[PDB]
Amino acid sequence: SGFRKMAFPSGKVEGCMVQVTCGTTTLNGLWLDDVVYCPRHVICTSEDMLNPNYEDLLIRKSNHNFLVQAGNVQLRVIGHSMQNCVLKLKVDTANPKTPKYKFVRIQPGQTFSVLACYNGSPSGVYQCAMRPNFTIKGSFLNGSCGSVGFNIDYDCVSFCYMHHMELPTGVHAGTDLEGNFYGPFVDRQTAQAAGTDTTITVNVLAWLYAAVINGDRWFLNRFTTTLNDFNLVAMKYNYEPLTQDHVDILGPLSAQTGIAVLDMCASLKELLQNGMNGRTILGSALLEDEFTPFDVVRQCSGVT
Amino acid sequence: SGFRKMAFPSGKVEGCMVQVTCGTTTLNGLWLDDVVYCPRHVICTSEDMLNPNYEDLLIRKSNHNFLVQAGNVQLRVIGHSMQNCVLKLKVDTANPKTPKYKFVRIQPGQTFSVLACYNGSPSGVYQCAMRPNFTIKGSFLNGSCGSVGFNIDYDCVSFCYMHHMELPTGVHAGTDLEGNFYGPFVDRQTAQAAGTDTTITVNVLAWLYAAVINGDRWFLNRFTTTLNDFNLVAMKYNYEPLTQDHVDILGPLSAQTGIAVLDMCASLKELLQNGMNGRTILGSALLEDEFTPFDVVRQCSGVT
Numbered sequence: 001s002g003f004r005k006m007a008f009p010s011g012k013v014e015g016c017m018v019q020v021t022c023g024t025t026t027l028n029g030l031w032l033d034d035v036v037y038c039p040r041h042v043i044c045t046s047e048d049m050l051n052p053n054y055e056d057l058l059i060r061k062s063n064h065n066f067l068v069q070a071g072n073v074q075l076r077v078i079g080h081s082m083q084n085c086v087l088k089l090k091v092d093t094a095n096p097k098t099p100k101y102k103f104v105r106i107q108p109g110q111t112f113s114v115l116a117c118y119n120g121s122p123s124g125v126y127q128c129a130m131r132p133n134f135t136i137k138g139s140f141l142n143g144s145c146g147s148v149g150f151n152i153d154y155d156c157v158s159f160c161y162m163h164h165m166e167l168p169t170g171v172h173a174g175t176d177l178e179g180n181f182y183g184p185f186v187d188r189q190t191a192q193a194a195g196t197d198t199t200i201t202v203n204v205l206a207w208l209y210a211a212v213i214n215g216d217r218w219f220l221n222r223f224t225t226t227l228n229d230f231n232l233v234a235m236k237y238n239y240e241p242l243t244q245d246h247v248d249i250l251g252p253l254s255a256q257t258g259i260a261v262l263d264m265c266a267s268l269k270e271l272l273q274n275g276m277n278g279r280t281i282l283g284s285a286l287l288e289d290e291f292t293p294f295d296v297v298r299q300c301s302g303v304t
Numbered sequence: 305s306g307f308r309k310m311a312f313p314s315g316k317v318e319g320c321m322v323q324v325t326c327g328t329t330t331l332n333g334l335w336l337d338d339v340v341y342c343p344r345h346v347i348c349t350s351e352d353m354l355n356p357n358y359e360d361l362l363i364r365k366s367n368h369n370f371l372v373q374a375g376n377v378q379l380r381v382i383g384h385s386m387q388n389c390v391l392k393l394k395v396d397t398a399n400p401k402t403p404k405y406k407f408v409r410i411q412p413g414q415t416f417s418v419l420a421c422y423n424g425s426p427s428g429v430y431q432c433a434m435r436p437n438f439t440i441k442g443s444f445l446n447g448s449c450g451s452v453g454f455n456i457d458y459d460c461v462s463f464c465y466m467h468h469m470e471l472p473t474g475v476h477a478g479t480d481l482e483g484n485f486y487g488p489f490v491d492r493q494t495a496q497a498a499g500t501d502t503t504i505t506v507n508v509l510a511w512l513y514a515a516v517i518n519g520d521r522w523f524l525n526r527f528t529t530t531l532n533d534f535n536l537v538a539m540k541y542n543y544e545p546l547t548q549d550h551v552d553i554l555g556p557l558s559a560q561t562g563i564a565v566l567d568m569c570a571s572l573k574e575l576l577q578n579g580m581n582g583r584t585i586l587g588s589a590l591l592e593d594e595f596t597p598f599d600v601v602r603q604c605s606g607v608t
């Protein structure tokens with residue numbers, strides 16, 4: 001028993017972390033096969049960030065201007081290209097520590113582990129979610145750009161995120177490993193709005209199932225509800241709509257505990273209306289929406 | 305910015321995880337040099353756990369009764385010994401992936417990362433604290449015994465914990481890597497009391513410094529306090545005594561923010577007395593005591 005915010009083991013991703021330097025700008029790179037991926041703003045200066053024309057800035061740079069380093073050893077950049085907001089540097093050596101990998105663009109509501117890195121070296125690992133408004137709440141400082149988000153499917157690493165920036169609003173924004181930003185953000189020094197964020201309803205329900213599994217049942221009531229009446233309440237408390245697909249996804253947790261999904265939606269309906277009266281659920285005095293139903297199944301069933 | 309419960313990168317510890325099997329009992333082992341460490345209850349059966357005489361049970365077992373496995377390959381146990389509550393199996397091969405390591409018995413109040421493992425394979429990594437009553441609040445299931453707790457000091461892994469058991473009370477209990485249990489627990493199927501737990505005051509203050517660093521300053525008041533008046537309040541709200549040594553430890557956070565330690569103790573004194581009125585600090589609606597002042601310094605300064 002016990003339920004923690006747990007990250008995937010970071011080992012397979014640590015062997016992919018290198019240091020990328022262009023001029024005086026030093027950030028992190030992801031080394032998979034003979035390609036080192038990093039955020040394109042590595043080619044910029046302080047003045048260039050205000051409104052960079054990356055096409056022009058990249059033309060001014062040749063392969064020899066990029067220093068890729070995998071520990072105490074240097075790699076040779078023998079090619080350079082721009083795929084959206086990422087730099088693809090073709091190195092002469094292919095990562096001997098490359099694991100089985102994939103590049104996936106994650107859906108909002110889904111979670112992933114971030115390996116926070118500074119100067120190509122890993123500092124720590126933590127789990128976060130892609131919020132419905134395509135922002136993430138990580139922990140990143142100057143030097144963390146190029147740090148990646150990932151999921152592990154047995155032995156295959158699915159890279160889903162690469163950190164690009166923290167906006168003046170404290171929002172963390174980045175791209176998938178094809179340089180496509182999540183949400184409406186751009187790699188430009190300008191004020192950018194994130195948009196109205198919402199609660200991931202299927203995730204709150206998944207964490208209420210984790211709490212039931214872990215002995216916290218105080219919130220279970222002799223009340224039931226319908227999907228429509230529940231979604232009327234969810235709308236009011238700015239929660240994402242609950243579909244029958246989300247009910248199906250919640251099925252393994254419904255089977256493990258014996259509590260139907262609508263009976264759980266009724267407990268959650270009361271939790272929103274009455275509050276929780278100081279009381280805690282899994283050691284939290286608020287509703288936690290950053291655990292997917294899949295993260296609950298994995299943690300509570302011992303998936304390795 | 306951002307402040308998360310962050311674990312050390314688990315890579316150096318994943319290369320030390322093997323599967324130990326004695327009879328029908330399968331758990332995790334830690335392979336360092338030519339020694340595989342695991343909890344001694346691996347030699348037990350369901351009937352043996354009620355009141356095991358481990359000296360007798362171990363005599364009944366010879367080296368050939370232990371199956372150590374490092375992935376898809378098997379190792380040869382050429383020696384076996386009992387150091388308190390751990391089994392030290394001398395294998396014929398020395399771990400090629402052994403990193404620079406140490407064995408430290410951690411103080412209550414300190415934190416560490418746990419690499420949760422099942423059948424010698426890592427499932428996830430999470431950070432937890434050794435509570436003042438020498439219990440931990442991890443996330444462990446059947447098959448997780450032998451999973452280890454650790455800290456990283458640049459490149460040196462300090463192993464501090466090995467999971468042994470979850471008591472009927474949900475408490476997680478285990479030993480240091482010398483088989484000495486933390487607290488008063490024994491590896492025997494009997495009801496065991498943990499003792500009165502207290503809040504780690506220096507840790508709550510460290511997390512209030514992390515919140516100030518991250519823009520949450522609402523709780524900072526035009527009030528100050530003395531160590532004695534603060535400890536009178538801390539006693540009331542079942543908080544660990546605050547020493548001048550804890551004030552010294554908090555110094556780097558005091559310097560970074562400009563807020564004296566006693567001014568922070570006064571904000572915390574009000575937080576205990578008034579509550580927090582639904583308001584959140586770093587996304588939590590309660591006081592968080594599982595971040596050491598050192599974890600705050602490391603996360604907020606980019607220590608790799």
Ligand SMILES: Cc1ccncc1NC(=O)Cc1cc(Cl)cc(N[C@H]2C[C@H]2C(F)(F)F)c1
Nearest residue numbers: 046049140141142164165166187188189305
């Ligand atoms: C500093 C940091 C912290 C956390 N995560 C990410 C980051 N880094 C960024 O955001 C990179 C970034 C992106 C944009 Cl579009 C502009 C700049 N501009 C120039 C001014 C200099 C700065 F690094 F000090 F910010 C920087």
Ligand SMILES: Cc1ccncc1NC(=O)Cc1cc(Cl)cc(N[C@H]2C[C@H]2C(F)(F)F)c1
Nearest residue numbers: 001350353444445446468469470491492493
């Ligand atoms: C199951 C588990 C879950 C989380 N962390 C740890 C564990 N495992 C334990 O506690 C091991 C343990 C220790 C003690 Cl002293 C007795 C037993 N007895 C026998 C009955 C069988 C059991 F595994 F099903 F519990 C087991």
